[PDB]
Amino acid sequence: QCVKLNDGHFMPVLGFGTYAPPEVPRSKALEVTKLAIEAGFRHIDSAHLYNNEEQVGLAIRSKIADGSVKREDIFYTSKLWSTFHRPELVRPALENSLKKAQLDYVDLYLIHSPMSLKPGEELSPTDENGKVIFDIVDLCTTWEAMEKCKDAGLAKSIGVSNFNRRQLEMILNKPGLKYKPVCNQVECHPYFNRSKLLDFCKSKDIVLVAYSALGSQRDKRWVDPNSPVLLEDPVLCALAKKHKRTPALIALRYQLQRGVVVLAKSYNEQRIRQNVQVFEFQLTAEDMKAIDGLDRNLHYFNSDSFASHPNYPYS
Amino acid sequence: QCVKLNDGHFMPVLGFGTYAPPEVPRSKALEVTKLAIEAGFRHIDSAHLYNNEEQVGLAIRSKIADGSVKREDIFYTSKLWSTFHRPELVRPALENSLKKAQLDYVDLYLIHSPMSLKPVIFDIVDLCTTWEAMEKCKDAGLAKSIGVSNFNRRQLEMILNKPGLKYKPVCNQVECHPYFNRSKLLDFCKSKDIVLVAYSALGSQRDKRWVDPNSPVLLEDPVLCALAKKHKRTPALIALRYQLQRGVVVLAKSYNEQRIRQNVQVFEFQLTAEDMKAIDGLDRNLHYFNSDSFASHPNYPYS
Ligand SMILES: NC(=O)c1ccc[n+]([C@@H]2O[C@H](COP(=O)([O-])OP(=O)(O)OC[C@H]3O[C@@H](n4cnc5c(N)ncnc54)[C@H](OP(=O)(O)O)[C@@H]3O)[C@@H](O)[C@H]2O)c1
Ligand SMILES: NC(=O)c1ccc[n+]([C@@H]2O[C@H](COP(=O)([O-])OP(=O)(O)OC[C@H]3O[C@@H](n4cnc5c(N)ncnc54)[C@H](OP(=O)(O)O)[C@@H]3O)[C@@H](O)[C@H]2O)c1
Ligand SMILES: O=C(/C=C/c1ccc(O)c(O)c1)OCCc1ccccc1
Ligand SMILES: O=C(/C=C/c1ccc(O)c(O)c1)OCCc1ccccc1
C-alpha cells in the first residue's frame, strides 16, 4: 500500500499525523505513535514545528527494537521550519531534527511552508506591535540546500508543503535542478479537494499529500469555529451508512482512490485503529463523484497576517 | 446554519436583536439575552448606541461560565456610533465597547451609519479614513470582521473603490422586510460578495419616535397570514424564513421568552418558490424609521 516516488523511493499511502496542540502533554505523542504503529501505520508525519520529534522518534525506535518493524519498514517525515529557509541554515536544522528524534535519516524532508520568516530562536518571531516578521528568501536556494541534504544521505527524499502551482513551477524550472520535489503536502479534503493542483502534480509525477483530510483539528488560532464541520457532512454520513463505515473512513478512502496520499491525526486509541481500516473497502465511481461535488474552496487554515505574505499560497 | 463572509469568517444566518427603547430597564437585556442563548441563538447584535453592551456581554459571559456555550460559539456584533467616525476616535470606541461587554474581540464591528455627528450637530468625515481605522482594528485582532450599516450603494462603492483598500466590508446591515425588501441593494451586495443583514425584519418595534403611526403592521399582512396557515407557522416565522431563502442574514428582536423560542424554529420548514414570489409582491417602499430631521445630512442614504 505504497506509491512509487519520482526518486525511486516508496511512500505508504496512509500516514499518521502527529501534531497535537500544546495543552496536550508531550508524553502522549510517544504513547500514541506506538499505538499507531501497532495498529498498522508505517508512514509517520512530524516536523520541527510540532516540538515532538524526540517523542515520535522514541516511538519508532521502540517498535524497531521490540522487533515489530524494521527501520526500513517505517517512512518518517520531518519538516524545515520557515525561520530556516536561508540555505546555510537548512542542513543544520535537519541535523538538529535527526538528533532530537535520535534517528540517522528521515525518509522525507519537506519545506514546511513557502512563507519565510525572520531567522532566529523563535518559531514565530514578532515585532514591537506583536506582528510576525517575514523574511525574504529565494526558495530555489533553499531547494538547493535540500538537494544537498539528500546527497548527504540525511533525507531519503525531499519535497515541499503548502506550495501552489506557481511555486512548484519555480522549482521545476530552476536551472541545474537535481531533484524534483517528490510531493507537495497541502490542505486537502472534500471541502477543498484541490482537483486542479492534483492534476498538475500528477502531470509532473509529484504526489499530493493531504493534510486536514478529516477537516482539521479546528484550532482556534487558525480555523473559524463556525466553519462547517467536515465529518458532519450529510453526504459523508450517508456514504458511511451505505458502506457500514464512518465519515472519517469515507474521507480517507476518497483520497486514496484519487491518487492522493492521506494523513490522519488521532490521539485516541480507537480512532487510530479505526483509520487503518481504510484499506478494507472501496467507494464506487458514483460515490467518488458525490464526494467531488462537496468541493467549496474552503481552506480551514486562515491568517490575516499571513495572507499578506508575498508567498501566501492562496493569494 | 452560517454564511461564509468575504474575509473567510463564518456568520450565523439568524441573529438576536438586542435593542429596546430606554423605557425598558437594562436588567431585561441581561435576562432576555440569556433566554436567547438558551433557545439556540448564537449571533447577537448590539451597538454602543443601545446602552446595553454591559448587560448583553454579562449574559454572554454568564452562559460561557456556566458551560452552556463557549466564546467561540457566540458571534457578537457591535457598532461604531456616528460621533466616533473621525479615525483617531475609532479604535478607542471599539476598545470601550470591548471593555463594557468584557470581551477580547468582537466577531463583527460595523460603522453604524454614514451620517457622521460632531464628536443634532452634523460632522463631515471622509468615511474612507474611518474605514482604514476599522481595518487597523481588524489587523489588531479586536474585530474578527468589519462591515457597515445603513449605507446605500454609492456609499458602498466609495469604500469598495478606495485606493489601497485592504478589506471589503463583510456586510451591510439595513432595514429589510417584505414591505421594503431592498431587492436592488441586495443584488448589488451579492454582486460584490457583501452579505445583506436585515433589521426590522419583523416590521420594527414601531417606536413612537420614528414610525408613522398609521403605517401598516407588517405581521398583519394577509399574505403573511395565509402562508403561516399553509405552513402551520406564524407570520413572524414566514417573514424570517423569507429572508433566509433570499440569501439574507436576518435579525429578530424579542424581549418575550416565548417569541424568542419561536423564532429559532425558522430552520424547521421551507417556503416554496411561489411562496417567495407572493412575499416579493408585498414591497411598498415603506421605511419604518422616519428621519427627516436627518434628510438634510450630506450622507443621508435616501437623498
Ligand atoms: N504541512 C502542514 O502545514 C500541515 C498542516 C496541518 C496538518 N499537517 C499534518 O497533517 C496531520 C493531520 O492533519 P490535522 O492535524 O489537521 O488533523 P486531521 O487528520 O484532519 O483530523 C484529525 C481530527 O479528526 C479526529 N479524528 C481522527 N480520526 C477520526 C475518526 N476515525 N473519527 C472521528 N474523528 C477522527 C482527530 O481527533 P482525535 O485526535 O480526538 O481522534 C483529529 O484532531 C497533522 O497532525 C500534521 O501531521 C500538516
Ligand atoms: N443598524 C441599524 O441601524 C439598526 C436599526 C434597527 C435595528 N437594528 C437591529 O436589528 C434588531 C431587530 O430590529 P428591530 O429592533 O426593528 O425589531 P424586529 O426584529 O423587527 O422585531 C419587531 C418586534 O417584533 C416582535 N416579535 C419578535 N418575534 C416575534 C414573533 N415570533 N411573533 C410576533 N412578534 C414578534 C418583538 O416584540 P417583543 O419584544 O414583544 O417580542 C419586536 O419588538 C434590533 O434590536 C437591532 O439589533 C439595527
Ligand atoms: O505556517 C503555518 C502552519 C501551521 C501549522 C499548523 C499545524 C500543523 O500540523 C502544521 O504542519 C502547520 O502556521 C501559521 C498558520 C497559517 C495559517 C494559514 C495560512 C498561513 C499560515
Ligand atoms: O438615530 C437614531 C436611532 C437609531 C437606532 C435605533 C434602534 C436601533 O436598533 C438602531 O441600530 C438604530 O435616533 C437617535 C438616537 C438617540 C437619541 C437620543 C438619545 C439616545 C439615542
CSV table of C-alpha atoms in Angstrom, one decimal, chain B residues 95-302:
chain,number,residue,atom,x,y,z
B,95,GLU,CA,-11.9,49.3,22.9
B,96,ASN,CA,-14.6,50.9,25.1
B,97,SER,CA,-17.2,48.5,23.7
B,98,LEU,CA,-14.9,45.5,24.3
B,99,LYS,CA,-14.4,46.6,27.9
B,100,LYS,CA,-18.1,47.1,28.6
B,101,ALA,CA,-19.0,43.7,27.2
B,102,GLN,CA,-15.8,42.3,28.7
B,103,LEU,CA,-14.8,40.5,25.6
B,104,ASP,CA,-11.4,40.2,24.0
B,105,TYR,CA,-12.7,40.7,20.5
B,106,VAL,CA,-16.0,41.3,18.7
B,107,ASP,CA,-16.9,38.9,15.9
B,108,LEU,CA,-18.2,41.9,13.9
B,109,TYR,CA,-17.7,45.7,14.1
B,110,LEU,CA,-19.9,47.9,12.0
B,111,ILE,CA,-19.9,51.5,11.0
B,112,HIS,CA,-23.5,52.1,12.4
B,113,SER,CA,-24.5,54.9,10.0
B,114,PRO,CA,-22.8,57.0,7.3
B,115,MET,CA,-24.3,60.1,8.9
B,116,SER,CA,-21.4,61.5,10.9
B,117,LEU,CA,-22.1,63.5,14.0
B,118,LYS,CA,-20.0,66.1,15.8
B,119,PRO,CA,-17.8,64.4,18.4
B,120,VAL,CA,-28.3,67.3,16.4
B,121,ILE,CA,-24.9,68.6,15.0
B,122,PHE,CA,-23.6,67.0,11.9
B,123,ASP,CA,-20.0,66.5,11.2
B,124,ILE,CA,-18.2,65.9,7.9
B,125,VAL,CA,-15.8,62.9,7.8
B,126,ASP,CA,-14.2,61.1,4.9
B,127,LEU,CA,-15.6,57.6,5.7
B,128,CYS,CA,-12.7,56.1,3.8
B,129,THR,CA,-10.4,57.2,6.7
B,130,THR,CA,-13.0,55.8,9.1
B,131,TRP,CA,-12.7,52.5,7.2
B,132,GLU,CA,-8.9,52.5,7.3
B,133,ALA,CA,-9.1,52.8,11.1
B,134,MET,CA,-11.6,49.8,11.0
B,135,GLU,CA,-9.1,47.8,9.0
B,136,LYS,CA,-6.4,48.5,11.6
B,137,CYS,CA,-8.8,47.3,14.3
B,138,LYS,CA,-9.3,44.0,12.4
B,139,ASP,CA,-5.5,43.7,11.9
B,140,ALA,CA,-5.0,44.3,15.7
B,141,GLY,CA,-7.4,41.3,16.3
B,142,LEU,CA,-10.0,43.5,18.0
B,143,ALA,CA,-12.7,42.6,15.4
B,144,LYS,CA,-12.8,39.4,13.5
B,145,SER,CA,-14.7,41.0,10.7
B,146,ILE,CA,-15.6,44.6,9.8
B,147,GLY,CA,-18.6,46.0,7.9
B,148,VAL,CA,-21.2,48.7,7.5
B,149,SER,CA,-24.8,49.6,8.3
B,150,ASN,CA,-27.3,51.9,6.5
B,151,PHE,CA,-25.0,52.5,3.6
B,152,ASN,CA,-26.5,53.0,0.1
B,153,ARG,CA,-24.9,51.7,-3.0
B,154,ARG,CA,-23.0,54.9,-3.7
B,155,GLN,CA,-21.6,54.9,-0.2
B,156,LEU,CA,-20.6,51.2,-0.5
B,157,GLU,CA,-18.8,52.0,-3.9
B,158,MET,CA,-16.8,54.7,-2.1
B,159,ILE,CA,-15.3,52.1,0.2
B,160,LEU,CA,-15.0,49.5,-2.5
B,161,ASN,CA,-13.1,51.9,-4.8
B,162,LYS,CA,-10.9,53.3,-2.0
B,163,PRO,CA,-7.2,53.4,-3.1
B,164,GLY,CA,-5.2,50.9,-1.0
B,165,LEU,CA,-8.4,49.0,0.2
B,166,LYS,CA,-7.3,46.1,2.4
B,167,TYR,CA,-10.7,44.6,3.5
B,168,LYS,CA,-14.1,44.9,1.9
B,169,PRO,CA,-17.0,45.3,4.2
B,170,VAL,CA,-18.3,41.8,5.0
B,171,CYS,CA,-21.9,43.1,5.3
B,172,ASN,CA,-24.3,46.0,5.0
B,173,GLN,CA,-26.9,45.8,7.8
B,174,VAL,CA,-30.0,47.6,6.5
B,175,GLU,CA,-33.8,47.9,7.1
B,176,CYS,CA,-35.2,45.0,5.2
B,177,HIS,CA,-38.6,43.2,5.3
B,178,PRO,CA,-41.4,42.3,2.9
B,179,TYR,CA,-42.7,46.0,2.8
B,180,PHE,CA,-39.2,47.2,1.9
B,181,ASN,CA,-37.4,44.1,0.6
B,182,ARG,CA,-34.4,46.0,-0.8
B,183,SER,CA,-34.1,43.7,-3.8
B,184,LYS,CA,-32.0,46.1,-5.9
B,185,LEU,CA,-29.5,46.8,-3.0
B,186,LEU,CA,-29.4,43.0,-2.3
B,187,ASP,CA,-28.5,42.2,-5.9
B,188,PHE,CA,-25.7,44.9,-5.7
B,189,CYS,CA,-24.4,43.4,-2.4
B,190,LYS,CA,-24.5,40.0,-3.8
B,191,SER,CA,-22.6,41.1,-6.9
B,192,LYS,CA,-19.8,42.3,-4.5
B,193,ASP,CA,-19.8,39.4,-2.1
B,194,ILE,CA,-21.2,41.6,0.7
B,195,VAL,CA,-23.9,40.0,2.9
B,196,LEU,CA,-27.1,42.0,3.5
B,197,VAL,CA,-28.1,41.7,7.1
B,198,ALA,CA,-31.8,42.7,7.7
B,199,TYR,CA,-33.1,44.7,10.6
B,200,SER,CA,-36.8,45.5,11.3
B,201,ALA,CA,-37.4,42.1,9.6
B,202,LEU,CA,-40.5,41.7,11.7
B,203,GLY,CA,-41.8,45.2,10.9
B,204,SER,CA,-39.9,47.1,13.6
B,205,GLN,CA,-40.8,47.9,17.1
B,206,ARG,CA,-43.0,50.8,15.8
B,207,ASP,CA,-41.3,53.2,18.2
B,208,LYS,CA,-43.5,56.4,18.6
B,209,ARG,CA,-40.4,58.5,18.0
B,210,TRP,CA,-39.6,57.1,14.5
B,211,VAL,CA,-42.6,55.3,12.9
B,212,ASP,CA,-45.6,56.7,11.0
B,213,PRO,CA,-48.4,55.6,13.5
B,214,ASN,CA,-50.7,54.5,10.6
B,215,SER,CA,-48.1,52.7,8.7
B,216,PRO,CA,-49.3,49.1,8.1
B,217,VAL,CA,-48.4,46.5,10.7
B,218,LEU,CA,-46.2,44.0,8.8
B,219,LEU,CA,-47.2,40.9,10.8
B,220,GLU,CA,-50.9,41.5,10.0
B,221,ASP,CA,-50.4,41.2,6.3
B,222,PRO,CA,-53.0,38.9,4.7
B,223,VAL,CA,-50.3,37.2,2.5
B,224,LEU,CA,-48.1,36.6,5.5
B,225,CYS,CA,-51.0,35.2,7.5
B,226,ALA,CA,-52.1,32.9,4.6
B,227,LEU,CA,-48.6,31.4,4.3
B,228,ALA,CA,-48.4,31.0,8.2
B,229,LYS,CA,-51.7,28.9,8.0
B,230,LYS,CA,-50.4,26.9,5.0
B,231,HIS,CA,-47.2,26.1,6.7
B,232,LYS,CA,-48.7,25.8,10.3
B,233,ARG,CA,-46.3,28.5,11.4
B,234,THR,CA,-46.7,32.2,12.2
B,235,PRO,CA,-46.3,35.4,10.2
B,236,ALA,CA,-43.1,36.3,12.1
B,237,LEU,CA,-41.6,32.9,11.0
B,238,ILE,CA,-42.7,33.4,7.4
B,239,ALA,CA,-41.0,36.8,7.4
B,240,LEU,CA,-37.8,35.4,8.9
B,241,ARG,CA,-37.8,32.5,6.6
B,242,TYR,CA,-38.3,34.7,3.6
B,243,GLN,CA,-35.0,36.5,4.3
B,244,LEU,CA,-33.1,33.2,4.8
B,245,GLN,CA,-34.1,31.8,1.4
B,246,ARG,CA,-33.1,35.0,-0.5
B,247,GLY,CA,-29.5,34.8,0.9
B,248,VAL,CA,-30.2,37.5,3.6
B,249,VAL,CA,-28.9,37.1,7.2
B,250,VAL,CA,-31.8,38.1,9.4
B,251,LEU,CA,-32.0,39.7,12.9
B,252,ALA,CA,-35.0,39.3,15.1
B,253,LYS,CA,-35.5,41.3,18.4
B,254,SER,CA,-37.8,39.8,21.1
B,255,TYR,CA,-37.8,40.5,24.8
B,256,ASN,CA,-40.6,37.9,25.3
B,257,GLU,CA,-39.4,34.3,26.2
B,258,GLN,CA,-42.0,32.5,24.0
B,259,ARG,CA,-41.4,34.6,20.9
B,260,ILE,CA,-37.7,34.3,21.4
B,261,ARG,CA,-38.1,30.5,21.4
B,262,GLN,CA,-40.5,30.6,18.5
B,263,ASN,CA,-38.1,32.4,16.3
B,264,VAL,CA,-35.4,29.8,16.3
B,265,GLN,CA,-37.9,27.4,14.7
B,266,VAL,CA,-37.2,29.3,11.4
B,267,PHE,CA,-34.9,26.4,10.4
B,268,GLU,CA,-37.7,23.8,10.6
B,269,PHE,CA,-39.6,24.5,7.3
B,270,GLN,CA,-39.2,25.9,3.9
B,271,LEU,CA,-41.2,28.2,1.7
B,272,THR,CA,-41.8,27.2,-1.9
B,273,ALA,CA,-40.6,29.3,-4.9
B,274,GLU,CA,-44.2,30.5,-5.4
B,275,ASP,CA,-44.5,31.4,-1.7
B,276,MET,CA,-41.4,33.5,-2.1
B,277,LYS,CA,-42.9,35.3,-5.1
B,278,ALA,CA,-46.0,36.0,-3.2
B,279,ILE,CA,-43.9,37.6,-0.4
B,280,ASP,CA,-41.8,39.6,-3.1
B,281,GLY,CA,-45.1,41.1,-4.2
B,282,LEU,CA,-45.6,42.9,-0.8
B,283,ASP,CA,-42.9,45.5,-1.3
B,284,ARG,CA,-44.2,49.0,-0.8
B,285,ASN,CA,-41.1,51.0,-0.3
B,286,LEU,CA,-42.1,51.5,3.4
B,287,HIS,CA,-39.5,52.7,5.9
B,288,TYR,CA,-40.4,52.1,9.4
B,289,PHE,CA,-37.7,54.6,10.5
B,290,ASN,CA,-38.6,58.2,9.6
B,291,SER,CA,-35.6,60.6,10.0
B,292,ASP,CA,-36.3,63.8,8.0
B,293,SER,CA,-34.5,65.7,10.7
B,294,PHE,CA,-31.7,63.7,9.0
B,295,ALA,CA,-32.8,64.3,5.4
B,296,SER,CA,-30.6,67.3,5.1
B,297,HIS,CA,-27.4,65.4,6.2
B,298,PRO,CA,-25.0,65.2,3.2
B,299,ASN,CA,-24.7,61.5,3.9
B,300,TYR,CA,-28.4,60.8,4.2
B,301,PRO,CA,-28.6,57.4,2.4
B,302,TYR,CA,-32.1,58.1,0.9
